[PDB]
Ligand binder design. Structure first.
Ligand SMILES: OC[C@H]1O[C@@H](O)[C@H](O)[C@@H](O)[C@H]1O
Length: 392
């Protein structure tokens, strides 16, 4: 009796998963659980290893996958996943999750994964006591961000913005783009109604370049956790990162939400929640099909989600989630999830297929070397044209 769970929740990302696995083993003492993590932030490495496994005809029993175009445009369109519609009926999940989330996991009459959480992409992290020590406020717009960072440089803080490796630069970019475009024109990139070469979308790169000039110059070789660490250390004032950062700071670093660290929407994005969702499905050919199905039933349940998510920094995907199980951050995110305008993340798989996502890092490289907004815009448009962005 075995179950092989594939994810990128290695190292200090693992507590939430490990808690779920312990729950699973209580319920199913027969099963030996193989925790098959591929180490690498945002699944860049996991994507590559999964590709080798799937094309080699050696699927894991289940794998971490983002709800939306990431899921649909890769293993679903390739006819490598089982339709979970019957399981959804069995478990009452069509009423348990918000309709918009069901839509992201649904395609051509099937339902293809089970959401375990909701993460938010557009969060700015800072330390209220450090900000007071520097005599500044948290910025609510990109203009105020840039002005505050200049003030901070004058006060001796060389790199007021913490930043890491390539994907985290893309991560920062999607917050900047959302602020510059607003939610409607953000959405219009992904349905092809707004071109990347439109002046409105070229401006995202202009603002992004200015913001980049506030960042640590060693960013390229740092993990997302190391970039958060710079803020905790006061070697930076701000970091733009998903709320897995809240999980890190509380679960791993034991910081108190609200006093030892704080949060706001990314500048210019207040009232908009840029979401992503980690989900698990059922690959065809799974060696341990029933054990995988029982894992899906667990990760889709209130018991599972309210055990794991408080550790993770995400909120539950289930509508019936108990807010008393969440700290001050989780409760704040829960409120915003219900009240805000929702849009999807690019970097975390909601809005664009992997064909585009995987090439966007190249676009980002060419912005870092040229610092030319038009070149970056033109590059993103060329990729969009090559992959037929909007066709799925
Ligand atoms: O690695 C950092 C993060 O990457 C996201 O793509 C993922 O959805 C999160 O669960 C977390 O793992």
């Amino acid at each position: 009796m075995k179950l092989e769970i594939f994810s990128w929740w290695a190292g200090d990302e693992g507590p939430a998963l490990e808690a779920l696995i312990r729950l699973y083993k209580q319920k199913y003492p027969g099963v030996e659980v193989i925790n098959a993590t591929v180490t690498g932030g945002a699944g860049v490495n996991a994507r590559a290893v999964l590709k080798t496994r799937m094309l080699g005809g050696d699927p894991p029993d289940t794998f971490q996958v983002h709800a939306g175009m990431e899921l649909i445009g890769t293993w679903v369109v390739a006819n490598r996943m089982e339709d979970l519609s019957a399981l959804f009926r069995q478990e009452g999940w069509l009423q348990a999750f918000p309709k918009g989330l069901i839509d992201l996991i649904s395609y051509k009459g099937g339902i293809w994964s089970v959401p375990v959480n909701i993460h938010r992409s557009n969060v700015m992290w800072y330390l209220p006591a450090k900000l007071k020590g520097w005599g500044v406020n948290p910025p609510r717009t990109w203009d105020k961000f840039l002005a505050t960072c200049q003030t901070l440089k004058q006060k001796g803080l060389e790199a007021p913005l913490a930043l890491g490796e390539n994907w985290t630069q893309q991560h920062l970019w999607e917050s900047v783009a959302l602020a510059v475009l607003g939610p409607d024109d953000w959405n219009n990139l992904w349905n092809g109604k707004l071109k990347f070469t439109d002046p409105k979308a070229v401006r995202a790169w202009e603002v992004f370049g200015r913001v980049l000039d506030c960042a640590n110059k060693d960013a390229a070789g740092l993990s997302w956790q190391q970039a958060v660490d710079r803020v905790v250390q006061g070697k930076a004032a701000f970091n733009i990162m998903g709320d897995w950062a809240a999980g890190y700071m509380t679960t791993t670093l034991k910081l108190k939400p609200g006093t030892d660290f704080a949060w706001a929407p990314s500048p210019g994005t207040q009232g908009v929640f840029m979401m992503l969702s980690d989900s698990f499905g059922l690959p065809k050919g799974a060696k341990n099909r029933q054990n995988a199905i029982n894992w899906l039933r667990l990760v889709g349940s209130k018991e599972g989600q309210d055990t794991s998510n408080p550790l993770k920094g995400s909120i539950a995907a289930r509508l019936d989630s108990d807010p008393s199980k969440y700290n001050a951050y989780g409760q704040s995110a829960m409120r915003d999830w219900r009240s805000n305008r929702i849009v999807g993340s690019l970097v975390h798989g909601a809005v664009a297929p992997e064909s585009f996502m995987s090439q966007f890092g190249t676009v980002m490289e060419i912005f870092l070397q040229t610092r030319n907004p038009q070149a970056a815009a033109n590059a993103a448009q060329a990729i969009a044209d090559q992959v037929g962005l909007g066709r799925l």
